[PDB]
Design a protein around this nucleic acid. Structure first.
Lengths: 58, 46, 105, 108
RNA sequence: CACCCGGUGGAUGGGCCGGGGGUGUAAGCGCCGCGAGGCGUUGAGCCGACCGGUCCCAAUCGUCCGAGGUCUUGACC
RNA sequence: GGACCCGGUGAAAUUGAACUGGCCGUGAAGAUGCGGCCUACCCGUGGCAGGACGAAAAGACCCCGUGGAGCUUUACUGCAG
RNA sequence: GCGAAUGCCGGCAUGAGUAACGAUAAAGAGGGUGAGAAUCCCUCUCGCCGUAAGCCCAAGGGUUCCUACGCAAUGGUCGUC
RNA sequence: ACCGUGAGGGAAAGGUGAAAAGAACCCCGGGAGGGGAGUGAAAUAGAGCCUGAAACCGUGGGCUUACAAGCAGUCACGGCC
RNA sequence: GGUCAAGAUGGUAAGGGCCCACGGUGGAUGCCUCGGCACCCGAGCCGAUGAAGGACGUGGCUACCUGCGAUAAGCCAGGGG
């Protein structure tokens, strides 16, 4: 039941152009609280446990 | 759904089986046909 | 509906037991207030109070355990007996920014 | 300068593509946290092909850090021609388009 | 998505707290009748977003990017 | 409950090709592509069906091939009984 | 001696990172193993059966059954299952 | 092999090298696979590994791109390379 | 030297179009052979002293291919080496 389907080879060009507006953007991350290193902006980690309280491990 | 496949040892077998084919003119025919002709195996062989 | 609850339920449950679990953003954000709320009841502390709290949780051990046990360790404050903390990672395939929450202590 | 790679790599060439198209031409160590703490799969992978990269060098291609990725790319190839529901009659297979993964690591 | 207000020198969420609204006097003990129940305590109890207090809770800490000032003519200081 | 935003996976018929606007005219007589004109930045996602004479299928309705196939009787002939 | 036969055969793009996850009987938490676990193991809440989502005899299919190792592909995501 | 209950249909798929001398060892890694060494006339001859073209997906560079129409384009004149 | 007033050219590209270099994907291609095809000369029957054709079967250690078959990669005798 294919009422509507493309009608003209999409054009690489365009095609991609389409797929164009797309794009990523690296995690905004920051740097350790005292953990020293780069963490997920706002969180402890396999480097932390801190923040202000030792709520983790390592 | 009942397709048409439900095999029946008893059945299929019987129905078809070395013998029979044999017993027959026809059957026999093709059979030794197949045989050479092709190689392979055969019904009942199945 | 019956599910919203259920949750709050077992989560409220499990938690009190440990006092800080690991569910995603929201999930936690709520299990808080509620669970939270519940607390405030362990605080009220009595026939009633208990007859509620349990009403949901369903289970002496705890139910009591908290009402008596913890309750106190809180008798003073003003709600918030929980500190919902987001987390660094995310469950796979998914990619859900889970998070952890505890009874502010 | 040296380089990392690996074909017969199961994954969305495309997807992959975004991968670098980020950490792309940039400080080692640096992106080394992009893919460490970025998101979408590939990463993991991507990361990998950076370590035997940073390695290979220093080890046999030699000055650490001062390094990075002068360039990085990925190509598709071998497919995985995959069969699916017979048009409820005729076959309809997709293709987990294999995935190559090269990537430079030269020193500042 | 973009768009608006706030980011602990905060009242922004929730929490609590008063307030309203809503359900029709609760759980318990009490006192009448073999029982069923009732009557009381008790307009109780319980309260989802509505109006507003209070730093209990949770908006910590941190990054990035961003100007410099184009060519001619003339009018005035 | 999908649809929408995330992560993971990841098809499908049709399609010469294409950066494809409205107009009023036109041509084989119902044109984004030809003429004159008027609005006209580059891309996108959530949609809404109108046009691309959209997709499906070399019309089954039509006629044409001294095409074919089935039933009919005082059609032709011939066989069975 | 080839665009060119809705040509045959093979590869390769489309739509398209949108359409689908095969019943709306839902899950969630703690521990354990592992290079790596929403998707495995133990455990504790919770939901669905219950005339079945019960065991049984058959017929059909034939090692699919257990145990120790392992995940390349098949498991429409993972996956140590 | 495979679709067919059957009679029957009925495929695709060859090539390293002079010979394995077929890659001990060290490296990132769970591995595959990638970095060195060694064979070597050459391994962009490296294990479906001779020649290995096109289509089609990439990575950099030159030029070019936001008051603009046509697949095309081709004639003129200009600037960058 | 600052201010107003006007007048004209430039850089900036999310992807994009053309040109160049380097991969990947894909196997055309040439050349090649343990295989066919074709025509000519040789030959021309097997069978119960259970044929042609299969079944299950041994290799020390195993699916397949094989040659045998139970005295199963073979047991005797003579010729060649």
């Amino acid at each position: 039941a294919k009422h509507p389907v493309p009608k003209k080879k999409t054009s690489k060009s365009k095609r991609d152009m389409r797929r164009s507006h797309h794009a990523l953007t690296a995690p905004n991350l920051t740097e350790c609280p005292q953990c020293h290193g780069k963490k997920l902006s706002h969180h402890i980690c396999p480097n932390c446990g801190y923040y202000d309280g030792r709520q983790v491990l390592a | 759904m009942k397709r048409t496949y439900q095999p029946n040892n008893r059945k299929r077998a019987k129905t078809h089986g070395f013998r029979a084919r044999m017993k027959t003119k026809s059957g026999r025919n093709i059979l030794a046909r197949r045989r050479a002709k092709g190689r392979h195996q055969l019904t009942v062989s199945d | 509906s019956s599910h919203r609850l259920a949750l709050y339920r077992n989560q409220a449950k499990s938690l009190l037991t440990h006092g800080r679990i690991t569910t995603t953003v929201p999930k936690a954000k709520e299990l808080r207030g509620f669970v939270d709320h519940l607390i405030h009841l362990a605080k009220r502390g009595d026939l009633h109070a208990r007859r509620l709290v349990l009403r949901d949780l369903q289970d002496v051990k705890l139910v009591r355990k908290l009402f008596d046990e913890i309750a106190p360790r809180y008798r003073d404050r003003q709600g918030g007996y929980t500190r919902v903390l987001k987390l660094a990672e995310r469950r796979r395939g998914d990619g859900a920014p889970l998070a952890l929450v505890e009874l502010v202590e | 300068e040296a380089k990392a790679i690996a074909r017969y790599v199961r994954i969305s060439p495309r997807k992959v593509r975004l991968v670098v198209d980020l950490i792309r031409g940039k400080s080692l160590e640096e992106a080394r946290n992009i893919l460490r703490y970025t998101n979408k799969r590939g990463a993991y992978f991507v990361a990998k092909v950076l370590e035997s990269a940073a390695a290979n060098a220093v080890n046999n291609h030699d000055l650490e850090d001062r390094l990075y990725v002068k360039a990085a790319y990925v190509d598709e190839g071998p497919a995985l021609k995959r069969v699916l529901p017979r048009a409820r009659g005729r076959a309809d297979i997709i293709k987990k388009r294999t995935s190559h993964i090269t990537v430079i690591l030269g020193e500042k």
